[PDB]
């Protein structure tokens, strides 16, 4: 005989370890149908911030247009949701991005040869040859002069290698962001495993 | 395709949530059906699958080049010793239960790391459809051509199939 | 797979004692996304109750 009072008297949680990335906690006497659903929602249904529309004003280097457009969307942005809100695709382009639904990013890098002597370290040999994730700069749109002032939009691991360049080459882009379910695409996924 | 001759279409892009997790929470990538093997007998895929385990921690050129190896000195029993010198699951059946369910399963699930390829002659430009379309000027028949996208041919020996069903208001 | 312990020991699973591991994406703390999951299901439970049956 099951009643929800009786669930309460024999349900336990053993939080064995709880870190800032990888939490590990035990459960007791809950059915598998509920416990899978908690696994089910944490991959799909918890929403997250991700880059969605990428506007390249100039892409000159060897990494192509569509490949580097794909990598920027993969970049996990260290911004809590319930700050943005959803987009609504029943309304056109100039109404679809507001001050409230879209973190707006941009990235501008040119490479030029640094005079150095050699067999040569290719950081010392060219200026800005690596395009790390910590070159993505937040641009404050709208009312975002104090509502992201404490937390500027920082990529959660700022050492992602977005591109490599050579002198002459440049990448000049503008990438919007959005809040969305992980059930659509695998860049909104709020969990590693 | 793997490197043993197992072709196969990407039949359905399956969501990662209703897909079985593993020992750790590993979810696989390419589910291949174990009914495919007994007509093929490609055991080289099975020994590649557990030496991908045994290459993913160790760093020597894993001698999958054959024939320095006997029946007594089987390379799945010469470097079957590597399974027992780091404590592997020696029968290769790695832990991997279903998810959509929430249980462990009957089998333990054979799971591994098999080097897959991707084939050239792809099929994303094949289908065509025609409601009423163009004609031909000689016969007022639908015009032949994949690139004009007209004229599925009902040949000589499909007319001699629709008679075979006894039907004729299909052949009409 | 041994002879000596072929029958002296058996293996089983405690069929209700789960061990969740929840790693993070770097945006959120892992205990908090578990709080988001247990209320999304509650957000999904109320919303069917707050939905009337027409045909």
């Amino acid at each position: 005989e099951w009643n929800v009072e009786k669930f309460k008297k024999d349900f336990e949680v053993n939080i064995s370890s709880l870190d800032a990335r990888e939490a590990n906690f035990d459960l007791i006497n809950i059915d598998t149908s509920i416990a899978n659903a908690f696994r089910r929602i944490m991959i799909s249904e918890v929403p997250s911030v991700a880059a969605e529309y990428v506007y390249f004003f100039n892409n000159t280097s060897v990494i192509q247009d569509e490949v580097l457009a794909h990598r920027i969307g993969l970049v996990p942005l260290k911004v809590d949701p319930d700050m943005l809100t959803w987009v609504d695709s029943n309304l056109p382009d100039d109404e679809k991005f507001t001050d409230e639904n879209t973190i707006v990013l941009s990235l501008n890098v040119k490479c030029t040869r640094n005079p150095d002597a050699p067999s040569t370290d290719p950081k010392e040999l060219y200026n800005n040859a690596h395009v790390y994730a910590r070159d993505l700069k937040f641009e404050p749109q709208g009312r975002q002069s104090t509502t992201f002032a404490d937390c500027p939009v920082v990529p959660a691991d700022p050492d992602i290698l977005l591109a490599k360049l050579r002198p002459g080459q440049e990448i000049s882009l503008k990438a919007h962001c959005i809040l969305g379910i992980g059930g659509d695409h695998a860049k909104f996924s709020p969990v590693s495993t | 395709s793997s490197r043993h001759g197992q072709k196969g279409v990407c039949s359905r892009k399956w969501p990662t949530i209703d897909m079985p997790f593993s020992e750790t929470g590993i979810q696989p990538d390419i589910i291949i059906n174990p009914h495919a093997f007994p007509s093929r007998m490609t055991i080289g895929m099975f020994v590649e699958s557990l030496a991908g385990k045994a290459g993913a921690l160790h760093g020597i050129a894993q001698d999958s080049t054959p024939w320095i190896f006997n029946e007594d000195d089987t390379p799945a029993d010469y470097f079957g010793e590597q399974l027992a010198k780091a404590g592997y699951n020696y029968h290769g059946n790695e832990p991997m239960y279903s998810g959509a369910t929430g249980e462990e399963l009957r089998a333990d699930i054979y799971v591994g790391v098999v080097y897959y390829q991707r084939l050239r002659h792809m099929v994303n430009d094949k289908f065509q459809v025609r409601s009423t379309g163009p004609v031909n000027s000689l016969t007022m028949q639908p015009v032949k051509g994949r690139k004009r996208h007209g004229g599925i041919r009902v040949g000589e020996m499909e007319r001699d199939a629709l008679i075979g069903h006894g039907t004729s208001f299909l052949l009409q | 797979r041994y002879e000596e312990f072929a029958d002296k020991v058996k293996l089983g699973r405690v069929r209700n004692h789960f061990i969740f591991n929840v790693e993070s994406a770097g945006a959120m703390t892992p205990e908090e996304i578990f709080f988001k999951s247990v209320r999304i299901l509650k957000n999904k439970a109320e919303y069917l109750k707050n939905c009337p049956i027409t045909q």
Binding site: S16, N24 | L57, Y78, A86 | N21
Partner: peptide, 24 residues
Amino acid sequence: RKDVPKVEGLKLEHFATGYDAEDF
């Protein structure tokens, strides 16, 4: 019929979950 030179110096790495360095 001697065998091939054994990998001088293997070590063990197939180990468990939730534990970091508990092999001694």
